[PDB]
């Protein structure tokens, strides 16, 4: 929460390999074409710090977005309006979890394994930054959700006594980004001779969108998460895994 | 006999000049202990501005063609890992060439029998005769003395008695095992302390020299341990480091399992 930013914040201006340095040239070739994203390999942060992977692998979902906005107050030193958040794309190859085998240890971890795409969507909108007023005070606000853990997690409040939710959301004046909803199926060489394939559903970000082809080989990097919608059971809930960063082959 | 400093001289007044090849050196292709020994034996002749050649060798019949074919300017030879057990003058067929021999020959071995003909009788074939392999054993020295030399029955078969006895002496040397005493990128670092060209990389040159010969091979490693345990605190930039800079190789001792 706090100064966690600045121990990122000097990961960035001063990792260096031997004579040409990565992270301030990738951020800046990343601008001029307007692409807006960042490659961090996943490698490379335990050569220069442990304990900093070390909250990384515990508790990722609240860290994360906490290195996008150390990515954003960097990139005001190099182009000096509306720079938006980055987003962060990370790449590993420690050791490949079989489709098969996901138990309930692994909720919230980062984890890697691999499969055939079956199907996609259609793209959506989620909403980053809006803007609120109310019907009888007329008293605006901002709420600017970055977090991201499908339903509702950050919703409108109760008071700014009013009436029960008085909040209205204004759509004149806001952001919004892309979801895509793929799915995804296990390898048939580990094979289920009494079983069916299972399968997966996953979600992408606004840089991973219509990157992939049904019917292709890939690998895949993400946070074993949970939702709880009832579109069969008491207390059950449903799993998927939050995408960020795949890691295609060459499509062939 | 021979130390270093005296023979490293006589290799630089007869090979700084104009032409190319003046020395020629030769390295097993096996000896993990023959490639760092020859690694740093490039960084000696690169500050002193010697020309080269770094020819592999394979087997014992590619050293005759080798040899054997390309004889110009040889003002140096130097052989490294091969040489130890083999005579010299027997199988390459060198007679003499004109003191001020035209071509010296410097061998580097690791093996246990000496091969009392190319030790003795050194007349173009430079040895490495310091008393490390050597451990200066005298009773093998006066049986080849007392050999090479060729009432008078009673003497001569007291000399063919002689004669007897000795031989059975050179059959008790000349009927052992090859095994290795000292490392070779152990010696040649101890030429290399007496230069006065001791870096951080030419010690990393050792520790990759002497560790080929500790997990299969006999075990001298205990006793070359103490040498370099005390190499590695002198050469030490402070006590207490910076906290990882990107620069700054630290070599250091740990504790570092099997």
Not at chain 1, 37 to 57: A, F, P, Q, R
Not at chain 2, 80 to 86: D, E, L, R, W
Not at chain 2, 96 to 124: K, M, T
Request: aromatic share 8%.
């Amino acid at each position: 929460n706090t100064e966690i930013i600045k121990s990122f914040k000097n990961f960035i201006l001063e990792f260096r390999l031997d004579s040409q340095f990565i992270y301030r040239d990738q951020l800046r070739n990343n601008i001029l074409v307007k692409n807006y994203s960042l490659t961090v390999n996943m490698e490379h942060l335990i050569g220069y710090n442990e304990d900093i992977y070390k909250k990384l692998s515990d508790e990722p979902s609240d860290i994360i977005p906490l290195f996008e906005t150390a990515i954003t107050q960097v990139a005001k030193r190099i182009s000096i309006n509306s720079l938006p958040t980055f987003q962060l794309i990370l790449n590993s190859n420690a050791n490949q979890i079989p489709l098969r085998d996901l138990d309930s240890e692994h909720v919230s971890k980062i984890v890697r394994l691999s499969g055939i795409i079956i199907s996609t969507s259609v793209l959506s909108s989620r909403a980053t930054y809006l803007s609120i007023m109310c019907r009888n005070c007329r008293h605006t606000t901002s709420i600017t959700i970055n977090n991201f853990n499908t339903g509702n997690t950050v919703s409108l409040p109760r008071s700014c006594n009013c009436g029960p939710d008085p909040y209205i959301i204004i759509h004149e004046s806001s952001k919004f980004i892309d979801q895509q909803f793929l799915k995804l199926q296990e390898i048939p060489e580990l094979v289920p001779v009494g079983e069916m394939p299972r399968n997966l559903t996953m979600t992408c970000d606004r840089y991973l969108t219509n990157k992939v082809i049904p019917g292709t080989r890939v690998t895949i990097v993400g946070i074993y998460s949970i939702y709880n919608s009832k579109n069969s059971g008491v207390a059950i809930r449903t799993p998927y895994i939050k995408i960020l960063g795949i890691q295609s082959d060459v499509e062939t | 006999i021979s130390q270093f400093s005296e023979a490293y001289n006589k290799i630089l007044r007869n090979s700084s000049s104009h032409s190319s090849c003046q020395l020629v050196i030769f390295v097993s292709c096996l000896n993990i202990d023959a490639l760092c020994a020859t690694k740093m034996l490039s960084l000696l002749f690169k500050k002193q501005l010697v020309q080269s050649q770094i020819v592999p060798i394979f087997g014992y019949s590619e050293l005759r063609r080798h040899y054997s074919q390309l004889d110009d300017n040889i003002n140096s030879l130097l052989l490294v890992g091969f040489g130890g057990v083999i005579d010299l003058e027997a199988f390459l067929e060198i007679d003499p060439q004109e003191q001020s021999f035209r071509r010296d020959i410097y061998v580097l071995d690791a093996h246990r029998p000496w091969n009392l003909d190319n030790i003795f009788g050194s007349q173009i074939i430079q040895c490495f005769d310091d008393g490390t392999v050597d451990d200066t054993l005298g009773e093998q020295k006066e049986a080849y003395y007392k050999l090479l030399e060729l009432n008078d029955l009673s003497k001569r078969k007291q000399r063919k008695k002689q004669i007897h006895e000795y031989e059975g002496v050179l059959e008790e040397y000349y009927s052992q095992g090859t095994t290795v005493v000292n490392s070779i990128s152990a010696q040649i670092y101890s030429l290399l302390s007496a230069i006065g060209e001791t870096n951080l990389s030419n010690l990393w040159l050792n520790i990759l020299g002497t560790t080929s010969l500790d997990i299969a091979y006999a075990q001298v490693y205990n006793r070359l341990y103490p040498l370099l345990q005390d190499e590695v605190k002198r050469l030490t930039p402070s006590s207490r480091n910076s906290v990882k800079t990107p620069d700054t190789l630290t070599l250091n001792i740990q504790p570092d399992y099997y």
